[PDB]
Write a protein that binds this ligand. Structure first.
Ligand SMILES: CCCCCCCCCCCC(=O)CC(=O)N[C@H]1CCOC1=O
Ligand SMILES: CCCCCCCCCCCC(=O)CC(=O)N[C@H]1CCOC1=O
Lengths: 162, 162
């Protein structure tokens, strides 16, 4: 964990975080953070290895308003796993359909709530045969991810905002 | 963890929170929470089994402004262990002495920061022969406490502010 705070630049920080997650079985991650009282998702500090095309489409299509993982993070500090049942509206189902196309079917999002009011999300996406297997994979490393999201929050907020 | 969300009142919640911690090896705990922008450290939402005489003395002496765990919580999301070196000022050394006499020698504080901008702390105090062994035992249950502090913050801020 230490290496995240004693890293020095965003490039290096992002690599380390990507490697920690990868080491926990996750090939794709996203770390997004907004400062206090903000809503400018355009100017949101973003880190990880989501497909670049998905990221740009996401941002263009205003999907942050449709993404149930985002609304959830505004309302809780607890993780949300990407289950069909979180995608409820037609919009959300079509978002689900596209997101699954970019290779984001299975995963979870840890809400991020910082000391200085920072708001964010750390998502981990995993590859598996089915949901039952994906969930086993995630559940096995869940207490580590839980520590990791707070470590990432503290060090990344310092990067993004100091 | 669910037993915490499935409880109805502060009475029931506090009993569950205290029993979990005890089952985990911690004889004393303190769960304190404030709403957003609050500085009312004395008139806060408090739960746990610290000695009653300690709490009364603490608040009356405005110890939340001296107690290093509280100032750390304002700035971070990461745990502060109750190490000798965190008490640096003379006022903190006199605090440390008085807390040691309440039996609060070995422990850690988890900073709490909620979705609706809640501010607080969840403390766990352990009885051990020495700081070597205490840190050892706290090390070994830290991933569980890490998950637990967020489950307690999410359900806690509910009962307190709704
Ligand atoms: C409350 C946090 C707001 C600040 C964070 C920056 C704003 C938008 C950043 C994108 C967040 C996501 O992209 C969430 C995610 O990982 N969704 C998964 C689920 C299925 O496919 C996906 O893309
Ligand atoms: C950012 C938090 C401010 C609001 C939370 C409630 C208000 C203050 C309540 C008292 C907090 C403590 O009591 C902290 C603690 O655990 N101190 C240990 C360390 C050695 O002796 C102790 O008593």
């Amino acid at each position: 964990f230490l290496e995240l705070e004693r890293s020095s630049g965003k490039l290096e920080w992002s690599a380390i975080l990507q490697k920690m997650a990868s080491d926990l079985g996750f090939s794709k991650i996203l770390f997004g953070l907004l400062p206090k009282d903000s809503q400018d998702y355009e100017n949101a500090f973003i880190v990880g290895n989501y497909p670049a095309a998905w990221r740009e489409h996401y941002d263009r299509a205003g999907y942050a308003r449709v993404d149930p993982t985002v609304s959830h993070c505004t309302q809780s500090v607890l993780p949300i796993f990407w289950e069909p049942s979180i995608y409820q509206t037609r919009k959300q189902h079509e978002f689900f359909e596209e997101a699954s196309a970019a290779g984001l079917v299975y995963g979870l999002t840890m809400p991020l709530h910082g000391a200085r009011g920072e708001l964010g999300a750390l998502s981990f996406s995993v590859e598996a045969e089915n949901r039952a297997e994906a969930n086993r994979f995630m559940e096995s490393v869940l207490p580590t991810l839980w520590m990791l999201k707070d470590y990432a929050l503290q060090s990344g907020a310092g990067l993004a905002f100091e």
